[PDB]
Amino acid sequence: AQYEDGKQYTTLEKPVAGAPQVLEFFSFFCPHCYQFAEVLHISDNVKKKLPEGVKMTKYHVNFMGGDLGKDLTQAWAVAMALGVEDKVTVPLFEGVQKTQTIRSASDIRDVFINAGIKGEEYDAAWNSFVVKSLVAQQEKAAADVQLRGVPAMFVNGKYQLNPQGMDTSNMDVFVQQYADTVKYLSEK
């Protein structure tokens, strides 16, 4: 049929219990993740097609970018904790990869400030137990899917998206096929 194991998706040989329904891993240092978020808008388009009541989650990973990468995973935990993922995603991607103006923890904080998150609020979150828990949560999730690279997306901790099996000659077609696969898997 249209959808086929090994084509638009693969099946984890050891599924993850309690995983988020739709789980994307990315790194602000990853060029393909920059392509996913800034040119393809994968996550916005996936969200648009998700069935009623199925929600999507993004976690940041550390195996890219060294110490700054660890800071960016903690900053993303701040963004989840504060609900500002959509305020900071673009200036964090561009600051790391486009202008290369993000080179320290302080530079990341400046992005949150300029996006409306006051400094005292950012520091409180940065040093909070909630954020520590969210860092550990992101790391545990990637380990549980034996994550080896990004970007990556998993549905119900069972199925892994396989973009290499999709048509890449037209980006809008690729995005449509990617999002329709997430829709199909979420209903499976």
Listing DSSP states for 43-83 in one string gives HHHHHHHPPTT--EEEEE-SSSSHHHHHHHHHHHHHHHHHT
Which residue in the block uniquely carries the two structure tokens 């200036």?
91
In angstroms, the first-to-last Cα distance of the chain is 14
Rg, the chain, Cα only? 17
Experimental technique behind these coordinates: X-ray
Rounded distance between C-alpha atoms, residue 109 and residue 88, angstroms: 10
What does the block give as tokens for 41?
A: 């808008």
Beta carbons within 8 Å of 63's beta carbon, 6+ residues apart: 27, 69
Rounded distance between C-alpha atoms, residue 16 and residue 135, angstroms: 18
- Helix, strand or coil, per DSSP, at residue 24: strand
Going from the C-alpha of 27 to that of each of 6, 8, 67, 125, 144, the distances in angstroms are 25, 22, 13, 21, 17
Ranges assigned E (strand) in the chain: 9-11, 22-26, 56-60, 152-155, 159-161
